[PDB]
From Swiss-Prot:
This is Non-structural protein 3. The lineage of its organism: Viruses, Riboviria, Orthornavirae, Kitrinoviricota, Alsuviricetes. It comes from Chikungunya virus (strain S27-African prototype) (CHIKV). Interacts with mRNA-capping enzyme nsP1. Interacts (via C-terminus) with host G3BP1; this interaction inhibits the formation of host stress granules on viral mRNAs and the nsp3-G3BP1 complexes bind viral RNAs and probably orchestrate the assembly of viral replication complexes. Interacts (via C-terminus) with host G3BP2; this interaction inhibits the formation of host stress granules on viral mRNAs and the nsp3-G3BP2 complexes bind viral RNAs and probably orchestrate the assembly of viral replication complexes. Interacts (via C-terminus) with host NAP1L1. It is found in: Host cytoplasmic vesicle membrane. Residues 4-163 form the Macro domain.
Amino acid sequence: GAMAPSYRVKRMDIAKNDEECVVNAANPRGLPGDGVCKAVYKKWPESFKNSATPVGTAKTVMCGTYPVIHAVGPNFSNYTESEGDRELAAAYREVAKEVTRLGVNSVAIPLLSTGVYSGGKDRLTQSLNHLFTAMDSTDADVVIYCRDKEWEKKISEAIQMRT
Ligand SMILES: CC1=NN(c2ccccc2)C(=O)C1
Ligand SMILES: [Cl-]
Ligand SMILES: [Cl-]
């Protein structure tokens, strides 16, 4: 574990992370996809060998020795708010089991089911709170990646408000 496990947020491409593993915002089919998934595909394409996995699950594939945890959040265009909420919580719980299993001291993570899978709604608080519920029991350093200046500020405020 990390000596003093922490949460941090950075506004930059998760493909440039400084952590021991990365969480992909994957599609269920293991396709290159869009947004974070496409950035992950360019940096670690070898990790998309047999990465297909159902909604609400995570599947780790090694790129060399670097673990890529493919986490499948729901696309809120297809799910009810209720069922989508359940699957989004579940995907983060599966990320926490994989981070623990791998024995990493740090993990790079995006906010699942924001952007293209958001169903046109602001889900920063919903996705971040499910991330916290899953990762709070882990002792890895968690570095949350985002691309929007206002989301960076709101994620930073949410981390500090619990400290
Ligand atoms: C920046 C981001 N804005 N959003 C977003 C999406 C729909 C409505 C409002 C906000 C994201 O998912 C990431
Ligand atoms: Cl960047
Ligand atoms: Cl963002």
